[PDB]
């Protein structure tokens, strides 16, 4: 086409979606990870994760307001990944990289799994 | 912080949100523009438009599944702007620039209003 493009548009959209999350505006699901609860927008979870994409395209699970993750999933690893979904920023540290990679593999977040594998290989 | 960043994350998120829109997945509102109907995600509309942000943060309008725009709003201008919201791409043409600018001013999409003003000034 003959379209023009606004370079910062996608980043600005994501920034506003994170502002909505921080204010708990139009969040439509709670992700339960052991004792911890995380509120989010199903569409953003689907856009970032192969696991959530599969869950919320399911004709029955699409209507659930609560999703319980596998008890092996670490709440901090999930929190770091949820922050990444809404910001593009990953808080990858020596102390959390194993839990982050395992959570990213479960959530099917291929690019995060790739950088964790590379950072582990370097050490 | 000590975060790393995935450059393409915001663009990939927006691409997936547009895929959900194209398949009518988890759309939660219909925007009525004269005789025309447009399905969308309230969160994406809010993230892109000062008008939708104000509408869906309203304690009563947040729960509406149908929003009717001012009858002066042109459906094609709205369609072009809705496509821009989900893609960062604006189909700005000689034949539509006046309707696009007027719709962007009504929707409070400041960056679109700015490029329309500049393109009009050049001609």
């Amino acid at each position: 086409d003959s379209c023009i493009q606004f370079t910062r548009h996608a980043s600005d959209v994501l920034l506003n979606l994170n502002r909505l999350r921080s204010r708990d505006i139009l969040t439509d699901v709670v992700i339960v990870v052991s004792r911890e609860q995380f509120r989010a927008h199903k569409t953003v979870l689907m856009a970032c994760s192969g696991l959530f994409y599969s869950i919320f395209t399911d004709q029955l699970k699409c209507n659930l307001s609560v999703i319980n993750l596998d008890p092996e999933i670490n709440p901090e690893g999930f929190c770091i990944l949820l922050d990444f979904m809404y910001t593009s920023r990953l808080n990858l540290r020596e102390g959390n990289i194993m839990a982050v990679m395992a959570t990213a593999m479960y959530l099917q977040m291929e690019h995060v799994v790739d950088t964790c594998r590379k950072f582990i290989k370097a050490s | 912080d000590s975060c790393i960043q995935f450059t393409r994350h915001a663009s990939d998120v927006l691409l997936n949100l547009n895929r959900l829109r194209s398949r009518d997945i988890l759309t939660d509102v219909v925007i009525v523009v004269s005789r025309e109907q447009f399905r969308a995600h309230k969160t994406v509309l809010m993230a892109c438009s000062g008008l939708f942000y104000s509408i869906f943060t309203d304690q009563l309008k947040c729960n509406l599944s149908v929003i009717n725009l001012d009858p002066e709003i042109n459906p094609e201008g709205f369609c072009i702007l809705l496509d821009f919201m989900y893609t960062s791409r604006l189909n700005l043409r000689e034949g539509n620039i006046m309707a696009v600018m007027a719709t962007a001013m009504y929707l409070q999409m400041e960056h679109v209003v700015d490029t329309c003003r500049k393109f009009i000034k050049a001609s």
């Binding site: 379209c3 023009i4 493009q5 606004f6 370079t7 | 791409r89 604006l90 960056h111 490029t115």
Partner: peptide, 4 residues
């Protein structure tokens, strides 16, 4: 704004 750019030409993509």
């Amino acid at each position: 704004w750019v030409i993509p």
